[PDB]
Amino acid sequence: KASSXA
Amino acid sequence: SMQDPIADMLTRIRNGQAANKAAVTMPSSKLKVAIANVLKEEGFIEDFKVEGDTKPELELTLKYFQGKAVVESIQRVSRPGLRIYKRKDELPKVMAGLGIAVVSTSKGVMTDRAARQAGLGGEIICYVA
Amino acid sequence: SLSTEATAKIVSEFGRDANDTGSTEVQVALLTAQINHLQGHFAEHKKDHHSRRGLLRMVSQRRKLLDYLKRKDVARYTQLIERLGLRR
RNA sequence: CUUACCACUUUGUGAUUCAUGACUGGGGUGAAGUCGUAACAAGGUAACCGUAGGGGAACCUGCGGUUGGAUCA
RNA sequence: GUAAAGCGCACGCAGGCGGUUUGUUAAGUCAGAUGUGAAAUCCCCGGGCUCAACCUGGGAACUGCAUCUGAUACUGGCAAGCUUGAGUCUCGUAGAGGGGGGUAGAAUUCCAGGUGUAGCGGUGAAAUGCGUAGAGAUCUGGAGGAAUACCGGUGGCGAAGGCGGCCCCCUGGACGAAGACUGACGCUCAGGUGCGAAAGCGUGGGGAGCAAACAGGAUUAGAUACCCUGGUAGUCCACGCCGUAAACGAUGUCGACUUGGAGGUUGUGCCCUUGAGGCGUGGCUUCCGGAGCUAACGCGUUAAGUCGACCGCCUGGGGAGUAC
RNA sequence: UAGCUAGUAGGUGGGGUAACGGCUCACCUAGGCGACGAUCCCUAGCUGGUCUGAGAGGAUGACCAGCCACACUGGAACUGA
Ligand SMILES: [Mg+2]
Ligand SMILES: [Mg+2]
Ligand SMILES: [Mg+2]
Ligand SMILES: [Mg+2]
Ligand SMILES: [Mg+2]
Ligand SMILES: [Mg+2]
Ligand SMILES: [Mg+2]
Ligand SMILES: [Mg+2]
Ligand SMILES: [Mg+2]
Ligand SMILES: [Mg+2]
Ligand SMILES: [Mg+2]
Ligand SMILES: [Mg+2]
Ligand SMILES: [Mg+2]
Ligand SMILES: [Mg+2]
Ligand SMILES: [Mg+2]
């Protein structure tokens, strides 16, 4: 919460 | 505090039976005798004995068979904290029969078989086998 | 605590003979005595709580005797409270 | 005609409850984000509990308590 | 007990529960009898639609309520007791139990005074700091606060929190021993009351040492820290508020019962007290362990064994002991 | 939700109804209810029974039958057994 988005 | 002798008797038997004790004493009562009687009369102990004047002393002779004692299990049913009155149809059958239920009736303190045949009911004191 | 005479005295005042030391009335008195005496003890101090714990037991115990008496001998109780001048 | 009762309805001031509200508080959830590495081994300053003060952050420090602390100190 | 769960601890009203004997009562309890418990349903045995579902005859059932009459062991009520539970008295016994009040002995710090000569201090190493306007080292007396080394324990007392120098004043409880006396007066406790470490809060004192905060020196990439030099609130006293801690045995209270072994502690009784002492009998308290218990680790006559009474609390983790 | 209660609780006497009754009215007593849960909130028609369950329980109240209440909403009487 949160790398590539997410 | 000491609010239930009747129970205390039963468990003195059970605690004694456990430790391979040959005898068991206790400050006595009429009802303890009433009970103690059903135990001989029904075949769980050899007999009682009351060495008493003002502070009686009921004494029981524990039965044994092999290396195991005679009172397989002895349970206080009714209690001051919870009273149990059965009728006659509702009288309990310990061990599907092979076991007695000490019940106090208006014609005296007998067994479930006895209370049954006598066709009466009362406060079930305790299960024994 | 409580003077051997003061004890003996009181036993021989409210009690139905000296040696009748276990009497209800006596105890009630023997207590009322102490309670009243210590009264000055925690008049100053106020912090001797541990003792006060003891005091309260005396007071408690007394109330439980006075009560016993009221259940038994209505007359002796009623006569007794006026006799110790308490209970209200 | 008149009186009593009394329903719709009118006024003032409270209570309560449901919805909603710019803004705001923490919470929860999100394979790989940024900062550091507090805890788990004696976690590299033994840890934790109550409380108090401080500090981007986990946390840091004082007082007392606990062993649910490793070690021949 | 460690999985969620024993209130930090006591006192106590209402309620629940209650030792032992006799008489009585007959409320609870038990027994029998009579009304009643609509029909349909369910269930049993049959009967009817070609079968079944469906429909239907009769019963059993409806575990109930009420009443009259009985039974009297247990429960309850009333009457009179009993003494083992509980409680008062008698003599002592041990004890950092409590509150109040003096004083003693080391030490730290500070001041004053002497010599002295350039160091002290601190660290992993350094520095800040204290001494070049003379410290530390160091010499003497005095002032003040805080706490009581050794004894000291594996101890003791207290409900718990907690309580250690010495001395004095008021005061709690426990226990042993003989008896004497009241005669079930008892156990437990929702609410209620009180006590309740340390920190914190108010007013006023007190303030040596130690020390949050804060400042400085170092360490580190950084270091709002660990370390070093300083140091304010605070710790101490008075009174009042605060009610929380891993307030722990993480184990509620009371009573009874169930093989042993090694100690500690404080008593009492018996042995020409003969002298190191011995052998009984209580209370309290460490350690190991049988059975039994337990998920196991472990508990084990101070149970977490075997029973009873009453209370408290738990119901997946998180959200949250938060919001309202 | 911890207090509730003025025709409130009782008595007397009038009146009232098919009928007992604070049902009503005047006067007099100061009561009546509540931790064995009054009051106040929220939900709900009840039972026979139905479903589940070994039972004890939990869940439920359509169809059948018994009972109650309601008839656009609030209120009211008249007629009449
Ligand atoms: Mg670490
Ligand atoms: Mg660490
Ligand atoms: Mg500390
Ligand atoms: Mg836990
Ligand atoms: Mg506890
Ligand atoms: Mg009787
Ligand atoms: Mg039927
Ligand atoms: Mg202050
Ligand atoms: Mg707490
Ligand atoms: Mg051991
Ligand atoms: Mg809060
Ligand atoms: Mg009249
Ligand atoms: Mg009339
Ligand atoms: Mg169930
Ligand atoms: Mg209408």
From Swiss-Prot, chain B:
Residues in the signal sequence: none
GO cellular component: a single term: cytoplasm
Record InterPro entries: Ribosomal_uS8, Ribosomal_uS8_CS, Ribosomal_uS8_sf
Statement: the UniProt record of this protein carries the keyword rRNA-binding: yes
Gene Ontology MF: a single term: structural constituent of ribosome
Top-rank taxon, per record: Bacteria
Keywords assigned: Repressor, Ribonucleoprotein, Ribosomal protein, RNA-binding, rRNA-binding, Translation regulation
UniProt GO BP: cytoplasmic translation; regulation of mRNA stability; regulation of translation; ribosomal small subunit assembly
Family stated for the protein in its record: Belongs to the universal ribosomal protein uS8 family.
Oligomer and partners: Part of the 30S ribosomal subunit. Contacts proteins S5 and S12.
Protein's job: One of the primary rRNA binding proteins, it binds directly to 16S rRNA central domain where it helps coordinate assembly of the platform of the 30S subunit. Protein S8 is a translational repressor protein, it controls the translation of the spc operon by binding to its mRNA.
Name under which the protein is recorded: Small ribosomal subunit protein uS8
Gene coding for it: rpsH
Curated annotation (Swiss-Prot), chain C:
Subunit comment: Part of the 30S ribosomal subunit. Forms a bridge to the 50S subunit in the 70S ribosome, contacting the 23S rRNA.
Coiled-coil parts of chain: none
PROSITE patterns for the chain: RIBOSOMAL_S15 (PS00362)
Known function: One of the primary rRNA binding proteins, it binds directly to 16S rRNA where it helps nucleate assembly of the platform of the 30S subunit by binding and bridging several RNA helices of the 16S rRNA. Binds to its own mRNA, stabilizing it 5-UTR and preventing its translation.
Similarity comment text for this entry: Belongs to the universal ribosomal protein uS15 family.
Protein name: Small ribosomal subunit protein uS15
A Pfam family it matches: Ribosomal_S15
Gene name of the record: rpsO
Regulation: induction: Part of the metY operon that extends to pnp, also has its own promoter.
Organism (species): Escherichia coli (strain K12)
Domain of life: Bacteria
Keywords: Ribonucleoprotein, Ribosomal protein, RNA-binding, rRNA-binding, Translation regulation
Xref: NCBIfam families: S15_bact
